[PDB]
Design a protein around this ligand. Structure first.
Ligand SMILES: *[C@@H]1O[C@H](CO)[C@@H](O[C@@H]2O[C@H](CO)[C@@H](O[C@@H]3O[C@H](CO[C@H]4O[C@H](CO)[C@@H](O)[C@H](O[C@H]5O[C@H](CO)[C@@H](O)[C@H](O)[C@@H]5O[C@H]5O[C@H](CO)[C@@H](O)[C@H](O)[C@@H]5O)[C@@H]4O)[C@@H](O)[C@H](O[C@H]4O[C@H](CO)[C@@H](O)[C@H](O)[C@@H]4O[C@H]4O[C@H](CO)[C@@H](O)[C@H](O)[C@@H]4O)[C@@H]3O)[C@H](O)[C@H]2NC(C)=O)[C@H](O)[C@H]1NC(C)=O
Ligand SMILES: C=C(C(=O)C[C@@H](C)[C@H]1CC[C@@]2(C)[C@@H]3CC[C@H]4[C@H](C(=O)O)[C@H](O)C[C@H](O)[C@@]45C[C@@]35CC[C@]12C)C(C)C
Ligand SMILES: [Ca+2]
Ligand code: NA
Ligand code: NA
Ligand SMILES: [Zn+2]
Length: 806
């Protein structure tokens, strides 16, 4: 109930939302069906429209008017935004040359530059350039401020997940808004765009910017606007709040536009009808900036112009139907569209089996335009698994397509030409970022980055301490003139042992064999030097990764590679080696095919054993440093050490061997040498974080050899590729992957073909940020470079996406 009997007189667009049943006068009251009876009359005036005219200049104040053209209007703070242009011979903000804002130029009583977030729904990255002709205010912000060529949204690329990621710096799996539609099995409640459940606070996790601000004594505007409030009124209301006395004035504001998304759905991202929506958004930006200039705030406020996701061509006829694959279609509930989430229609149906569903949706049609996954097998870069609101079964849909349950869902439930929601590395899903103001840099282009990072920066812009979040604070310091955050490297927690030769061959009862018995102070002193780390500066180029949790591990040096070998997990945490552009690939020799050699530095009791592999009929093994890339026949023996071995399913070995034999050398040819760091990952609870020893669900049969869920590699080279990776003067270039360690290649429909037709495609899908590998391993890389730490933080958040140019 709401006793809407109170009055909004003197309360229009109040910031403090008042409690039931007292009627509300804030920008969300309409949405809660809760506004006082006179809210429209007093708060949403429209008379005479939104622009001053010559005949209105110096008029007598008429309180009925939407905005004012009278002489008192500037002090009152309620002029039309074009008032000084029409009445005082001033220029529009867009028509002024840009001039660098070296310091804030704010009126007295401003304690810090305000922040205004201007968020546009469905604003595809390529609109900045393709629409630049019809967007002159936006184009001036972009070209005069700091911009990225694009900004990467989170998966799924839908409105609510992304708008709440912007506000919190969290992945959807962490903030809990995992789609526009959700079922929470614990609450037994459903969340939908239309309905009352979405208003319930229990859905919304983490700590959004407005709560962060409020809790730290920084006043916030109310971020969101009921759909019926026209954009011109939203702008005028922001400009009003900015004219409030110092003790009442908010320090952060948001404007939100439903466009161009709304038109994009109807017309496609580039439908000819899309020009007018882009003009309209630009006019709105122009009104803000003229209004700011009027208040002498246009060289004082920081403005972020930011989108939530882009828009793709999607029509009705490009729909896959689950009824075409499954006999049992009415036994499931599907959350459909540009992603699929499947669960049992009924909890009482014990004939429901996810395995049989996955199988029936796996590579069944030539051009099948979706791919099923259990959620833990989704690419780790998506960070889309650790929430009970995300169903176990997921359909990753091809761009341009939809999945649906049955044809009747699609013609009896076409209109649309655009949609979004797809994999967040798809070029059409990319969105925009522009920062303009005293705190941002001047005419600066910054590389693409992810929207998870912005929360930290908005906290920085406001002098707030950010809540714990998934950004990497400092990785966007290069966007900023001032207010940078100077993080320090985490302290290493465990220090390594450096074991020498401590064990005789006969102490090992591992069931391994090696034709290595075939046998000089020249090279014998030389190879002892190699075991002491004499070639380490070649193979460990950025220092050793720091271990950020308590554990017991050994650094092992070899001619061709260095490693940090875990005595707990019985295998390396990391293996680091450099391959020059001129390195040669050799074969595994015949007499070494099945060779595994004990490592005299590491006890039997801390080693793997070959018997365990012989007796495990599902498990084989691979090597982290590839034997194919030994520097010499003699050095090749090091690669067959039991301490270089890791468990690998035969299906996975096909992937790994092709990577090691073919791709590494190829990368070295293309990048002028590469430094590779490889290693296992264990994430049995799919939370994106390194498992402790007690969390491992699977071991090599009869042993304590834990089976990795994933294998990573971090491949680093010189950004300036005319310098060799090992002698690089400047910035680095990286790409990385996290490959799921799976006993089949069902993910790859083409896998019965030669690896050259499917392995690289698999690896591209499982591309990763170094930061992702860090969360998953508790390692910190790039500890010793010549580079600034913020620059290394940026490198660590880099994702190599393999998409062609935006
Ligand atoms: C991205 O950034 C975020 C934030 O930095 C990272 O997420 C954090 O990860 C931490 C480790 O997983 C986690 O710490 C846990 O917190 C528990 C208390 O949490 C409550 O309070 C906080 C703080 O205000 C609040 O934010 C939480 O909100 C979550 O939960 C509600 C659920 O309704 C949601 O509304 C909300 O969206 C959020 O959900 C998300 O997180 C939870 C986990 O908390 C997931 O389950 C959800 O799916 C969703 O992803 C909470 O309200 C605390 O109880 C935990 O402590 C247990 O575990 C530790 C391990 O060290 C152990 O020492 C403790 O003793 C304790 O164990 C006991 O409970 C066990 C399980 O019940 C049991 O097995 C034991 O026997 C013990 O009895 C834990 O410390 C932190 O909460 C989240 N924060 C957020 C905001 O999500 C995230 O990791 C980052 N991602 C990446 C890839 O880096
Ligand atoms: C849980 C908290 C919240 O604030 C919860 C808070 C984040 C939630 C509660 C209400 C909510 C679901 C609104 C619903 C109506 C919608 C509008 C409309 O449909 O008329 C509009 O079209 C776009 C938009 O999607 C919109 C405004 C929102 C967005 C998010 C909101 C504000 C704490 C953290 C304070
Ligand atoms: Ca884990
Ligand atoms: Na085996
Ligand atoms: Na296959
Ligand atoms: Zn949309």
């Amino acid at each position: 109930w709401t006793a809407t009997s109170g009055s909004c007189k003197g309360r229009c667009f109040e910031l403090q939302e008042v409690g039931p049943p007292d009627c509300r006068c804030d920008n969300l009251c309409k949405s809660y069906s809760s506004c006082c009876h006179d809210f429209d009359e007093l708060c949403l005036k429209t008379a005479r429209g939104w622009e001053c005219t010559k005949d209105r200049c110096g008029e007598v104040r008429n309180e009925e008017n939407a905005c004012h053209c009278s002489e008192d209007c500037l002090s009152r703070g309620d002029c039309c935004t074009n008032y000084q242009v029409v009445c005082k011979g001033e220029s529009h903000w867009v028509d002024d040359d840009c001039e660098e804002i070296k310091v804030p130029e704010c009126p007295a009583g401003f304690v810090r530059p305000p922040l205004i977030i201007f968020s546009v729904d469905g604003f595809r990255a390529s609109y900045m350039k393709k629409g630049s002709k019809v967007m002159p205010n936006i184009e001036k912000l972009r070209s005069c401020g700091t911009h990225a060529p694009y900004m990467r949204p989170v998966y799924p690329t839908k409105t609510f997940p992304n708008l709440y990621t912007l506000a919190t710096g969290l992945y959807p799996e962490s903030h809990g808004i995992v789609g526009n539609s959700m079922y929470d099995p614990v609450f037994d409640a459903s969340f939908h765009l239309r309905g009352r459940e979405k208003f319930n606070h229990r859905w919304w996790g983490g700590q959004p910017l407005w709560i962060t601000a409020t809790k730290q004594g920084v006043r916030a505007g109310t971020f969101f606007w009921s759909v019926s409030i026209p954009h011109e009124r939203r702008i005028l209301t922001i400009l009003q709040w900015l004219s409030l006395p110092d003790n009442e004035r908010p320090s952060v504001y948001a404007f939100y536009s439903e466009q161009p998304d709304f038109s994009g759905h109807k017309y496609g991202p580039f439908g000819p009808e899309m020009t007018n929506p882009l003009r309209e958004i630009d006019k709105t930006v122009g009104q803000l900036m003229d209004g700011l200039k009027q208040l002498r705030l246009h060289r004082c406020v920081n403005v972020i112009f930011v989108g939530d996701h882009g828009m793709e061509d999607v029509t009705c006829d490009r729909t896959e139907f689950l009824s075409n694959y499954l006999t049992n279609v009415d036994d499931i509930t599907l959350v459909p569209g540009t992603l699929g989430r499947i669960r049992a229609k009924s909890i009482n149906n014990s004939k429901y089996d996810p395995k049989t569903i996955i199988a029936a949706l796996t590579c069944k049609k030539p051009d099948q335009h979706f791919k099923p996954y259990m959620k833990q097998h989704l690419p780790k870069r998506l960070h889309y698994a650790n929430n009970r609101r995300i169903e176990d079964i997921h359909l990753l849909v091809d761009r341009r397509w939809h999945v649906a349950r049955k044809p009747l869902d699609v013609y009896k439930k076409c209109f649309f030409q655009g949609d979004h929601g797809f994999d967040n590395k798809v070029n059409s899903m990319q969105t925009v970022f522009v920062g303009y103001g005293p705190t941002f840099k001047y005419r600066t282009k910054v590389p693409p980055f992810e929207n998870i990072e912005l929360y930290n920066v908005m906290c920085d812009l406001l002098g707030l301490k950010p809540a714990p979040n998934n950004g990497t604070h400092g990785s966007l310091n290069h966007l900023l003139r001032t207010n940078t955050f100077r993080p320090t490297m985490p302290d290493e927690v465990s220090r390594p042992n450096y074991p020498g030769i401590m064990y005789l061959q006969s102490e090992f009862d591992l069931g391994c064999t090696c034709d290595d018995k075939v046998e000089n102070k020249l090279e014998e002193l030389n190879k002892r030097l190699h075991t002491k780390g004499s070639t380490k500066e070649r193979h460990l180029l950025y220092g050793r990764p720091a271990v950020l949790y308590r554990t017991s591990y050994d650094i092992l040096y070899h001619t061709d590679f260095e490693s940090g070998y875990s005595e707990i997990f019985l295998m390396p945490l990391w293996t680091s080696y450099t391959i020059s552009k001129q390195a040669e690939v050799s074969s595994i020799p015949e007499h070494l095919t099945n060779c595994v050699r004990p490592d005299v530095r590491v006890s039997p009791g801390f080693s793997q054993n070959c018997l365990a592999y012989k007796n495990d009929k599902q498990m084989s093994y691979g090597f982290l440093f590839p034997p194919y890339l030994s520097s010499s026949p003699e050095a090749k023996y090091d690669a067959f050490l039991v301490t270089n071995m890791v468990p690998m399913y035969p299906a996975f070995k096909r992937v790994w061997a092709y990577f090691q034999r073919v791709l590494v050398k190829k990368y070295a040819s293309e990048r002028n040498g590469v430094n590779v760091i490889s290693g296992p990952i264990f994430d049995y609870n799919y939370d994106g974080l390194r498992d402790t020893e007690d969390e491992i669900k699977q071991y090599v049969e009869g042993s304590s050899i834990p089976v990795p869920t994933h294998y990573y590699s971090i491949i680093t080279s010189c950004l300036d590729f005319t310098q060799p990776a090992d002698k690089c003067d400047g910035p680095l270039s990286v790409s990385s992957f996290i490959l799921p360690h799976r006993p089949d290649n069902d993910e790859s429909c083409n896998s019965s073909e030669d690896e050259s037709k499917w392995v690289e495609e698999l690896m591209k899908m499982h591309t990763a940020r170094v930061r992702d590998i860090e969360h998953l391993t508790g390692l910190d890389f790039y500890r010793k470079t010549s580079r600034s730490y913020s620059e290394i933080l940026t490198l660590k958040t880099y994702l190599h996406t393999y998409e062609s140019e935006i």
